[PDB]
Amino acid sequence: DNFFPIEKLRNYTQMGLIRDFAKGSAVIMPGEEITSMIFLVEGKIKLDIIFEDGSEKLLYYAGGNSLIGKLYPTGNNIYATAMEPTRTCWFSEKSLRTVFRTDEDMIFEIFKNYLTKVAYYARQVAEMNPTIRILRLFYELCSSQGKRVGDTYEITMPLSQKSIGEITGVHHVTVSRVLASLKRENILDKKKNKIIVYNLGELKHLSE
Amino acid sequence: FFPIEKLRNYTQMGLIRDFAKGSAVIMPGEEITSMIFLVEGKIKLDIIFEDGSEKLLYYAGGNSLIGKLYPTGNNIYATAMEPTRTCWFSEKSLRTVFRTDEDMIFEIFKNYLTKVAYYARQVAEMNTYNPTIRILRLFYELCSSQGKRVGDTYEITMPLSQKSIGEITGVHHVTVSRVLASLKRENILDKKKNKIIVYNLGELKHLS
Numbered sequence: 001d002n003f004f005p006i007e008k009l010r011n012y013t014q015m016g017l018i019r020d021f022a023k024g025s026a027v028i029m030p031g032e033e034i035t036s037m038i039f040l041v042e043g044k045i046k047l048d049i050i051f052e053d054g055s056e057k058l059l060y061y062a063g064g065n066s067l068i069g070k071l072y073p074t075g076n077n078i079y080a081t082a083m084e085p086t087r088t089c090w091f092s093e094k095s096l097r098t099v100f101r102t103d104e105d106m107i108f109e110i111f112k113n114y115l116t117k118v119a120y121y122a123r124q125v126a127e128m129n130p131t132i133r134i135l136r137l138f139y140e141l142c143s144s145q146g147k148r149v150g151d152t153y154e155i156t157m158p159l160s161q162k163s164i165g166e167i168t169g170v171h172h173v174t175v176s177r178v179l180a181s182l183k184r185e186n187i188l189d190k191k192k193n194k195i196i197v198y199n200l201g202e203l204k205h206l207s208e
Numbered sequence: 209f210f211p212i213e214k215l216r217n218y219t220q221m222g223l224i225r226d227f228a229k230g231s232a233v234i235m236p237g238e239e240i241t242s243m244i245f246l247v248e249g250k251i252k253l254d255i256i257f258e259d260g261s262e263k264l265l266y267y268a269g270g271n272s273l274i275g276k277l278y279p280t281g282n283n284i285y286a287t288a289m290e291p292t293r294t295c296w297f298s299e300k301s302l303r304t305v306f307r308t309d310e311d312m313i314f315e316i317f318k319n320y321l322t323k324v325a326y327y328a329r330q331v332a333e334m335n336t337y338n339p340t341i342r343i344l345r346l347f348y349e350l351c352s353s354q355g356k357r358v359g360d361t362y363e364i365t366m367p368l369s370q371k372s373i374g375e376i377t378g379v380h381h382v383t384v385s386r387v388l389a390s391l392k393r394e395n396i397l398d399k400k401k402n403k404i405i406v407y408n409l410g411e412l413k414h415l416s
């Protein structure tokens with residue numbers, strides 16, 4: 001929710017383009033290339049990221065005085081919709097120059113807003129041992145679905161690393177590291193249609 | 209993140225500070241009110257949490273910008289990994305830069321936006337704001353690979369406690385209880401003793 005509302009932007013809306021949106025209309029469309037900052041004069045906007053597989057995850061809720069800082073291409077596919085009657089002011093690069101030439105302080109208000117967002121998201125990435133969750137998942141899977149094949153358990157299941165990451169809330173880069181380490185230590189080998197457990201005892205132990 | 213090589217043209221407007229390998233660019237608890245341009249060298253920048261736990265935020269090299277012009281309320285610690293030359297730009301000294309070249313405002317916006325785009329995508333990937341989804345995904349994966357079809361239903365044989373579901377998915381046990389109760393009420397899935405019955409795989413697949 002609310003990011004360093006830029007309330008002083010209220011005074012410069014005459015220098016951008018007003019765009020009003022009815023409840024449920026898409027303020028940003030999937031694959032729409034936005035090259036404007038969007039000021040929320042009043043309303044509520046829900047902004048999501050759409051990953052390259054079509055999953056749609058919430059980033060934030062924007063309300064009165066919020067700034068959507070999407071002045072340039074980002075590599076994230078964004079989809080934003082109005083959740084009430086929303087009035088917005090759109091500020092292209094050209095119109096921001098007009099703002100800065102009137103009031104230089106506005107450059108620093110916008111820095112503060114971006115800075116608030118980096119501080120917020122970076123801290124959350126950091127806040128989130130998540131590794132134990134992958135071990136608990138393999139342990140529960142092995143102990144109920146695992147078939148004894150000589151001195152190994154086999155779980156017949158196409159469980160992609162993407163699915164492991166989604167189930168456990170573990171970043172896709174940590175999943176691959178955990179699995180590499182599991183293989184190297186002769187514990188578990190996560191192949192394509194099967195998972196092979198060589199050491200159920202140590203797996204149980206690591207997981208508890 | 210977007211490097212700002214052009215800021216090398218304006219270091220005479222800032223304060224040059226050199227750091228030896230291993231020395232602190234930013235000290236624990238230091239109040240930073242300057243952007244820090246890395247002319248040459250290499251910096252590791254960590255967040256320090258209130259328990260004393262330290263976590264990487266990023267590595268920075270040639271032409272990188274540390275955007276900490278205002279207090280954020282994170283405790284940050286940043287060390288030189290090699291001998292490093294830096295240029296410190298206060299708000300005043302940044303105003304002198306922008307009076308000379310208005311485009312440096314927008315170069316800094318791009319740098320900031322690249323950082324929000326990077327951290328926000330990571331937060332979004334991990335379903336931080338909709339962690340219930342990790343539960344649906346667990347059930348969906350289990351059913352699609354281990355489910356046996358019985359009329360218009362699937363049976364999975366799996367002793368799985370709510371405490372286990374929460375430990376696997378990183379989801380609070382109260383949310384776990386609420387999700388299992390709603391699944392059963394909506395006739396989607398029921399976990400009856402050691403058997404998971406899915407009545408509506410299609411709907412469970414849709415939700416996850």
Ligand SMILES: O=C(O)Cc1ccc(O)c(Cl)c1
Pocket residue numbers: 047059067068069070074075076077078114117321324325328
């Ligand atoms: O567009 C992006 O990739 C991320 C994003 C979304 C909304 C914002 O207000 C910002 Cl600064 C960035």
Ligand SMILES: O=C(O)Cc1ccc(O)c(Cl)c1
Pocket residue numbers: 115118119122253265273274275276280281282284323
């Ligand atoms: O200081 C912070 O809280 C986060 C931070 C760290 C480094 C940076 O370059 C930025 Cl823009 C923010």
